[PDB]
Design a protein around this ligand. Sequence first.
Ligand SMILES: NC(=O)C1=CN([C@@H]2O[C@H](COP(=O)(O)OP(=O)(O)OC[C@H]3O[C@@H](n4cnc5c(N)ncnc54)[C@H](O)[C@@H]3O)[C@@H](O)[C@H]2O)C=CC1
Ligand SMILES: NC(=O)C1=CN([C@@H]2O[C@H](COP(=O)(O)OP(=O)(O)OC[C@H]3O[C@@H](n4cnc5c(N)ncnc54)[C@H](O)[C@@H]3O)[C@@H](O)[C@H]2O)C=CC1
Ligand SMILES: NC(=O)C1=CN([C@@H]2O[C@H](COP(=O)(O)OP(=O)(O)OC[C@H]3O[C@@H](n4cnc5c(N)ncnc54)[C@H](O)[C@@H]3O)[C@@H](O)[C@H]2O)C=CC1
Ligand SMILES: NC(=O)C1=CN([C@@H]2O[C@H](COP(=O)(O)OP(=O)(O)OC[C@H]3O[C@@H](n4cnc5c(N)ncnc54)[C@H](O)[C@@H]3O)[C@@H](O)[C@H]2O)C=CC1
Ligand SMILES: [Cl-]
Lengths: 284, 284, 283, 293
Amino acid sequence: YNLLKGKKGLIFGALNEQSIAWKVAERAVEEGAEIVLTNTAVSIRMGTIGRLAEKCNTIVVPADATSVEDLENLIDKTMEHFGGKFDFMLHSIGMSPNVRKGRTYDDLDYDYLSKTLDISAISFHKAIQVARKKDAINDWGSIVALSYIAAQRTLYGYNDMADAKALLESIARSFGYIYGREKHVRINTVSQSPTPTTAGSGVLGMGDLMNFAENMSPLGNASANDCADYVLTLFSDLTRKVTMQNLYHDGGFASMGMSRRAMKTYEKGMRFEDVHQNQYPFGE
Amino acid sequence: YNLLKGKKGLIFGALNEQSIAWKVAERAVEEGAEIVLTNTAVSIRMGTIGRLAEKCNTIVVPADATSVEDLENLIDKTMEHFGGKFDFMLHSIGMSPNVRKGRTYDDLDYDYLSKTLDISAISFHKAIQVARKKDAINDWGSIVALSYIAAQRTLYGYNDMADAKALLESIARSFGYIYGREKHVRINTVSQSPTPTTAGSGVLGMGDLMNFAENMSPLGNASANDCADYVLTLFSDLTRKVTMQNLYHDGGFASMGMSRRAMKTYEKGMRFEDVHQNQYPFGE
Amino acid sequence: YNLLKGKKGLIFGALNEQSIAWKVAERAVEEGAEIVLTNTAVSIRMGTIGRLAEKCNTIVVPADATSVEDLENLIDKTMEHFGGKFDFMLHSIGMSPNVRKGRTYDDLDYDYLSKTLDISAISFHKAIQVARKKDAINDWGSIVALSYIAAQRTLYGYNDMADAKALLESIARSFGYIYGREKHVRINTVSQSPTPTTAGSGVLGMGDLMNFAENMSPLGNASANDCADYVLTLFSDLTRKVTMQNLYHDGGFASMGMSRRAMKTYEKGMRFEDVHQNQYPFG
Amino acid sequence: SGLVPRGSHMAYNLLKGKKGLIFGALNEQSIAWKVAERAVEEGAEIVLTNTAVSIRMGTIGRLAEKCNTIVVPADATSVEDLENLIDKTMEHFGGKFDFMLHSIGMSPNVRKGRTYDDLDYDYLSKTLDISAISFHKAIQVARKKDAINDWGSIVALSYIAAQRTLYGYNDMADAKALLESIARSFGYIYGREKHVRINTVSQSPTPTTAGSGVLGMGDLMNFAENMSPLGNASANDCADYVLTLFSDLTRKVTMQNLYHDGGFASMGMSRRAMKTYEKGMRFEDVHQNQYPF
Ligand SMILES: NC(=O)C1=CN([C@@H]2O[C@H](COP(=O)(O)OP(=O)(O)OC[C@H]3O[C@@H](n4cnc5c(N)ncnc54)[C@H](O)[C@@H]3O)[C@@H](O)[C@H]2O)C=CC1
Ligand SMILES: NC(=O)C1=CN([C@@H]2O[C@H](COP(=O)(O)OP(=O)(O)OC[C@H]3O[C@@H](n4cnc5c(N)ncnc54)[C@H](O)[C@@H]3O)[C@@H](O)[C@H]2O)C=CC1
Ligand SMILES: NC(=O)C1=CN([C@@H]2O[C@H](COP(=O)(O)OP(=O)(O)OC[C@H]3O[C@@H](n4cnc5c(N)ncnc54)[C@H](O)[C@@H]3O)[C@@H](O)[C@H]2O)C=CC1
Ligand SMILES: NC(=O)C1=CN([C@@H]2O[C@H](COP(=O)(O)OP(=O)(O)OC[C@H]3O[C@@H](n4cnc5c(N)ncnc54)[C@H](O)[C@@H]3O)[C@@H](O)[C@H]2O)C=CC1
Ligand SMILES: [Cl-]
């Protein structure tokens, strides 16, 4: 569509070809954008962002998004790369040392929790505050962070990441009010389906949680590729009046109370009794 | 507790001893309130409200809550009975001819739908408008309607009643703004668990829907007795600053994304892996 | 962008060049869609939709969206025009006889309220039910209705239309579950800024309400043209996994509790004390 | 006009036989002070707690005397202090108790006049710890010691900045969003196990020590007042609402964020909030009572 022709952007969090940020990167460049990539020194070494950088004809700047100093260096190197200001920024970063080290929500380590909140939420505030201090972002620019419905409605096992996502979504509102009134920069969260990614694979019983979400979601779970398509609309000029929103991209999960497929009495091929026609939507 | 000592109220919708309004009536009188009861002529003949009125030492005034003329007579008869104004009013009325006659949501009769919205929602506006025109309600009075989470999140089978509840909840906001600023009268909805009542029994697959909600709700489903206890707090002086709220009374259902019990892989006695202690909350 | 190349759509409610539906129609055809237009016989005679049909190289099918018979005819004529099924549908319809006749929320006529709810909300269920019975909509198709935040939070004067919008948004969820699981058709509401349209000009003190929302919204109110741009995304393949959503398109109004500009004590030129830099965002 | 009528004593014995732990009573203006007084009038036994510094600078000693109980010093960010607090509370009651009020909030960023676009991130860490994580710390310690009876009730105080942005409210808005999530996360666990309910009360802007620290609090309270059809809720009003949540009557209410704000949370635009409105202007949205004030 050439949706982002002439646009420049900074993308965090592309680890491997499964990463939501990897798909956003590829699609942004396919749609005419120029991008800069960033990840931690460890993720650069252990994943395949080098191949993405090659495909997108750009550079990878190492940064820890919890380090104001690293973020300052990143914005300088990004603005140097572009020869000035850029239009869009994707925060696609999440990690809990509690989840990683198998600490349960009722037995948290509070030093771990501090890192969960810093990596998964405060990093967004740190990126925006540094970018804004350096005036890195053009008027009518677009900032997105990826979030999850555990921020609003509890999911068994999701642990301290649920609370981190509630904090992340609040920062989008808090900083969105400031950046919008000044420079018409919109800031939104995209609340994505459970998705098969490195960070996703660390969620307790993720395969079973994904099946639950699939059964609840009338359109089924959104893929990482689907998410990239949606994020492209938020980077495009067509969403210039959308700000401070938490935007569910989940095939309807957020709006569902009880699907037929989620019921324990349901088996595939049972007749749907809530409709007069198409009573076998998943076949006989 | 004598929570409603000196208070006078009008209770709609007591059909039989299963009715949420029946429990609210019993409990209101136990807590020192004087009440007036109303139902349709047909429901008075077909149900047991006569026995409740005997227990509560009061009158039953026949009224169709879709009839402004019946509501005018009801308010006159209520104020005559009390010798003037009263403090609280319970709307506990719901019916869909589409649900009763097995019309599905994709095959509605639109005359039936008009009646669903009239009985289940517009009757609330009619009751408040007629009461307020006759200045029937004391300053710092309390008006409650009973609603259901389908108003926000879709449940398989719930049909046109979901849309009616969304409409009912909006009327509580719209009229609450007016009655609050004028006479400090609070207007709220209580969003109750799925409950075994005459109206509840008409819901598609209600037993299985109740089972789903019970698995999703950490405290379990609320009974009609539990709901009456909660409604008593809204009629009491202790909630005088709570208005235009939709209050979930549901053992946590509204705030749950996915419980362990709701998962198809779960069986009774399986160890919970989201906690360090009490891993068998439902026994081994 | 060619965002809607090869797509076909039915657009309700284009009255005149200020209508949100008029802007959606222009922008849909600019983006490569083919459309069919509809409005009431009265609106076709009193408005300028004929001019839009000419610019969009298409037909105007008369229909009362409260009439199942008229919707059945409309969907037949639309499918005949396209030679089969279509991809998107815009519901852009609202009217309150209570508001029009100066009846206040505390003194409703209940026959007028029944018409408000029919025109403003039930018409959306009627359109979807008829279309679905005729299998009118392609898999991965997109249905949008225009709504307003009065559905969630009370605005002085907005009257029975607030209640109608809550009902409208519920229909999107109820029907969205069914059409989604069957044919992957998404159904969403766009909750738009107060906008200077014919319907908008009927709102009690619309000018003052629009100024309140402008001051509360950090990006400012969304225009009808801005709204048309957003609706384009929902008809595009890029939003295929977005359904049963009420989507605030309002420059941030829905997420604001209190802006500096909303405060009685604020005057244009006062220093913003909540930031370290850009303390004069409005000069 | 919005001042709720009081005078005659309300004695409902709502909390007769119940035992509670109350955080955050600094002085007679504190919401937690009102909750403590009202809980004892309704028949409860309480234990009080605050920081060493707050105990020394404030008047909690007076409250402790009125409520015939002890003040246990504790920094609610310290797991060790909370472990001590829960042991001293259970020793005082001779076992488990029924309710706990978290009424704690402070931002070093707000106190030091650091703005949201120029946060100190060590200060932010402390805002989040004091204002939100402390609630997790208190529930985790209490639950590990099985301190709370079946059908018990835990409440924390929050503010609508958690959902809708208010000019100047700063990093406390984000802290309140985190606090309300902890209520849901821990409510699921404590509910399913022992039917212990956990809720937040989202209160009006209130003239307290912590409240007076909010940038232009006077002007924010006036905006909320004009936007709230019943007017702002007082600390006394909030205490009355919290009593219902500690009472048996709310046993099926959990993981809720409960707005106690005279309707502020459900309002889009009040007539009073509009710049064109002056006292005594006719309301045109109604046919009757067009001069409601
Ligand atoms: N996979 C899922 O189910 C869902 C994921 N999300 C969110 O999407 C975002 C991206 O994650 P995914 O693509 O799923 O997984 P991923 O594992 O591909 O990406 C996570 C990224 O976070 C980066 N990261 C970790 N710590 C960092 C630090 N200190 N500084 C900078 N970067 C750091 C990692 O290097 C990695 O590139 C996360 O916020 C995640 O929570 C949201 C909803 C669902
Ligand atoms: N049972 C459930 O699962 C739930 C019920 N509710 C609501 O609680 C309210 C009370 O219903 P329940 O006690 O469950 O059932 P119920 O069958 O005991 O009460 C329904 C009442 O509505 C009355 N009614 C019907 N048409 C009427 C008319 N035209 N005018 C006046 N009254 C009329 C009936 O006579 C009956 O007394 C209803 O609004 C229902 O939707 C809310 C949440 C869940
Ligand atoms: N103007 C505003 O401030 C806002 C408007 N909206 C909504 O946008 C939609 C379109 O209205 P606007 O473009 O603002 O005004 P408009 O006056 O340009 O369009 C309203 C349309 O509804 C049509 N209509 C009325 N009765 C009808 C019937 N029985 N059948 C079929 N069509 C009928 C009219 O003919 C007209 O074309 C409405 O739902 C409105 O409530 C939503 C948010 C804000
Ligand atoms: N006043 C207002 O406008 C509103 C206040 N709230 C909340 O109500 C709660 C109570 O505050 P208020 O009664 O308004 O003010 P307050 O100043 O009377 O109470 C705040 C309390 O927090 C305590 N505290 C501070 N740091 C602590 C620590 N490390 N450990 C233990 N305690 C500590 C203070 O000693 C004090 O007792 C707070 O969570 C506040 O944010 C909620 C909504 C509105
Ligand atoms: Cl399903």
